[PDB]
Amino acid sequence: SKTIRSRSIWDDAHAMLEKAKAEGISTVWDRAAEQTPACKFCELGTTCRNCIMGPCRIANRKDGKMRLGVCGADADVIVARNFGRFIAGGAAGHSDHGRDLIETLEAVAEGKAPGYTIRDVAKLRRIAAELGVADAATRPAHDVAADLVTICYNDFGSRRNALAFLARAPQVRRDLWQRLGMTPRGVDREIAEMMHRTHMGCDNDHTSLLVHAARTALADGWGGSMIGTELSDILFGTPRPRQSTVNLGVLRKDAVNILVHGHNPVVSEMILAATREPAVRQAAQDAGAADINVAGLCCTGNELLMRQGIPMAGNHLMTELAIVTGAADAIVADYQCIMPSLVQIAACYHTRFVTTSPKGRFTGATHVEVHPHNAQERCREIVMLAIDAYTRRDPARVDIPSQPVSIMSGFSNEAILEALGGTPKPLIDAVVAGQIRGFVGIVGCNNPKIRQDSANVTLTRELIRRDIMVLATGCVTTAAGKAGLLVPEAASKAGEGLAAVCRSLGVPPVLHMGSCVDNSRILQLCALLATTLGVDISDLPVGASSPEWYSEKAAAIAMYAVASGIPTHLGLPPNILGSENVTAMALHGLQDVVGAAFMVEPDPVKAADMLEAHIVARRARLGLTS
Amino acid sequence: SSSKTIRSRSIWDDAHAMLEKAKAEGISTVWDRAAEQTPACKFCELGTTCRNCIMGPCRIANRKDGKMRLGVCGADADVIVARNFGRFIAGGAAGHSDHGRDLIETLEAVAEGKAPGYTIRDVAKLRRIAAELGVADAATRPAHDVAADLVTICYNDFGSRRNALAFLARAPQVRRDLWQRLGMTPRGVDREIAEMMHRTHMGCDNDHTSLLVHAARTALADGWGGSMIGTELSDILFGTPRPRQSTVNLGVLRKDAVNILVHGHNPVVSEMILAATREPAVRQAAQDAGAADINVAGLCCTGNELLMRQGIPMAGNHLMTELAIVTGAADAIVADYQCIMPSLVQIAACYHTRFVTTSPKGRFTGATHVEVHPHNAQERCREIVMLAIDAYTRRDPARVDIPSQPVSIMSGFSNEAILEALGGTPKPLIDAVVAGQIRGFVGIVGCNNPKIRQDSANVTLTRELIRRDIMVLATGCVTTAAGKAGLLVPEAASKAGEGLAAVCRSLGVPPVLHMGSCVDNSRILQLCALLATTLGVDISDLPVGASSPEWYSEKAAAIAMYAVASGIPTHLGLPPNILGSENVTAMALHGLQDVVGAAFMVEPDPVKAADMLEAHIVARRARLGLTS
Ligand code: SF4
Ligand code: SF4
Ligand code: FES
Ligand SMILES: [Cl-]
Ligand SMILES: [Cl-]
Ligand SMILES: [Mg+2]
Ligand SMILES: [Mg+2]
Ligand SMILES: [Mg+2]
């Protein structure tokens, strides 16, 4: 099928799309076609529903009519408020994630979280000391955890002048944020202030709205997400390099297949632990399975990969196709980026669709709510549901289409520094010498507007060919992994300088750094490099790219990268092109404010050209002559 | 007016006169733009459109081929509409949240000695509120120590560690128990807003019932959190309202004075503007410029506040705001945030009027920004008044048309003022309800909306209710409506039924009690909670109602939602953008009755709205066993 071929570059996606068509199962691609053409006002951002004097639409008419909303707001204000609420939704997605990790560490510190513990005590004491906990090196671990919990919760309060982890940013960058009124103060506060500013008759200046959009996103990258990453390492272990596999072939016909979907390792890590209990394994054996096979989807899959080496079944647009294999006995979901279509596709099979979060409710799902105090009991119950579902699997409808592809994961900053000998100097020396021209974080989603992973893979291949090391997070992990680029042998696909450094270190030219929350690791790495060199992040040869993004979370990441000084490419435009002034600020004006700007470019080769050009300009401003 | 169009836009002569003047001068008004935006987009109107990711944007249609039944992610009309309504409520809750937060920061600055010109105006209320919320020895410790501890309690409600907001303890136990089992208990003022934005991200909360339950939780975090903190701390800093006389309508502007209109919500600004205008050297500068004096007049909620606490006359409500500039006598607008139409900047530029912004959150392209904070407000507000005096020297006398004589009103009915008028306890009020002299109470709290002839429904409903012996509690835009109708004075007892007239005359109060700004709808919650606790019943058992006949804003929807979720039947004149989902609509109008003991009503006929509100009151009186 030419239609099926154009929807993905991967054979496992093609096979399941053929199977879905034969069974009459509609997919995300089919509904994307139904929603094309899109509403032009919605696509341009020139529409507002923020009060019932409206709703309003804006046009650029020579007769002057419909230039303003009923309240008098123009296209610049309307577009900027819509973009601000878009970013606020993304920041909120990460904020609640981080909040749940604080709650879990608190429960551990109180001794009220059976099955949870502090699995990286050394990092707990290091992070606590970094953030000002007294005597963090020597006091009892649960006391230190309690004080760290208080620091993190206070960043979710309204009394700080700056978030705790913001101290990692170089002084020049913190001074810039302070002058601009961009310093993030509270993780929830900035989100709430964005919703206030975008109410009718509050903030009606597009520049002011975009500045607070930056502040809101910064409260994610340096707050909600960074707290989420660092406490996740403390509770579940700091990632270290390890081998795994990727694609739909990680599912096993002879096993109970449990797919974890969403973002919360507080659930997926306890699901994994339940599948390892002797009586649970025995129940699977008694049902006829060879054993129990946990496989990851989305960000929670990324995190199980980073910390446990659990193979990943696929990324965003693979999620429906994973069920169509007919071998998914249960989907265990928490929250964010979980398409509700999965509930209906699971209903075409035996698959149990289990929700676990009070925030991730799906009509028709089997809800087994998980909290730290009951997770060990509840996750055992969920695995037993999966084993029962396995007994009802129809063998005539099973088709697992591929052989899994080997990958290497686990490149936390701690792992990178260890591979470098303990200091960033060997990496800095390679950048100075020109063996590594720079670094690009490729961090985006999938989007039905783009042939799945075609841009993700092409950009990754282009950058490493040009001696630009790629840091991969989120959906891009599966893309690069299936492309064979997440292994040390992929140094053969890099340019001569990057290949030599990778082979000297024994690492791939593409480093898996985790989930979308773990883009905070990229912020930490940039801050460390800038601080070591005595410059701003906006002076580093770095970039970020989201070639196939779709979510509000992805836009929030892009915004906090830009606001932190990282040039950021998007494959597709946000819904802002109805305002030339807002668009010009995003693409150009922000350069003269925060030292970086957005780029929109659907050709991944041209995107590589633009990212390299920024890196070349940054190298020149550092005076590098190589 | 002789123009049928102009007559159709408002019931008031001062609005008619300025609409004629605006048209003659080529000034476009909110009504003109409302016509340009009619007809509206059908999907936006119905709520069946989604822009929450760029897999979309999506529209939900009812087609024969079954296409466009779902968004690209698979979400149906119920989820999309519920998420849109949830973000709508969160925007309104956030409007009040930041307001309340700024009052905490101001009280903190006073407690620290870092707010020149600000004091604790009501120390007795400070000690009472602090003791109520658990401050140790609030009755005896130094006032600034007590204030610092109250500040900490309020800030903790803007944190993430509480199981329930501090003021929620005012609600009856039966209501708190119900919220707890529903998962509706508000925990943190900012937290519920942030969680709503998380739930409405693609692929998070995809159950319309869950989404509406959290919308109720988010709104409750406003009414019992952001707004109630705002009200109580505003009383502490600026005084508890007491009954007093004032005036309303565009005739409160003075041709012979420097006219300064305060607009927005923040008394932290308006009280210091007023203080600056009373300084002898500032008054002398105005007189040296040719003015008799400086004349402060209120708009919107900050006008409501200055009326309640200082008796400052109010120039008008929402749809009067553009028309106030068209008088040609507005020498300055001093704005802070919320419900300030950006059209006012352009209309001000048609005149001499200075448009001054004061909040880092309320930025308007082209405005004169003079940012106000507690530490500099005394100095900055003086600078702002001097800007107004300078603007006055540039006023064109030939373009001045102040069209009416002001109407006398009575304001200041805080709960403290009501209880004092009753002799100290609610018992005489309860006795009048039991005796059937007052059948019940309705808060009329809404906005204006160009979809409805200005104040036609506000005034008709108010008249209908008091005629039926239902006392009206008026806040927000309705204050100006009831005031211009002559209903905010004790003599208006003649317009009420026999029972309400007798009670009003025995107390010397109007049949319509002005209880303040939109933040002060928290006073109505406190009153309902007090009556329910005193009677030993739920708020859902009281003969009460709420009504927003001409609403427009997200803030107004959040107020309506927290009224419903607290057990108060709530009427809206116009539907929220939800009718594209029958299930969400049915939940709002009917299903919530069997969840929280109250529901929304949508009814554009104010007489029929009166019938529906009365029928609820009749049923609650029956459930209380009243036979009168
Ligand atoms: S806020 Fe202004 S532009 Fe938006 S819907 Fe309301 S009147 Fe229209
Ligand atoms: S969240 Fe779902 S319904 Fe909304 S725009 Fe995205 S794909 Fe469409
Ligand atoms: S659907 Fe209403 S403007 Fe796009
Ligand atoms: Cl004292
Ligand atoms: Cl509590
Ligand atoms: Mg706990
Ligand atoms: Mg500022
Ligand atoms: Mg302060």
Ligand SMILES: [Mg+2]
């Ligand atoms: Mg619950």
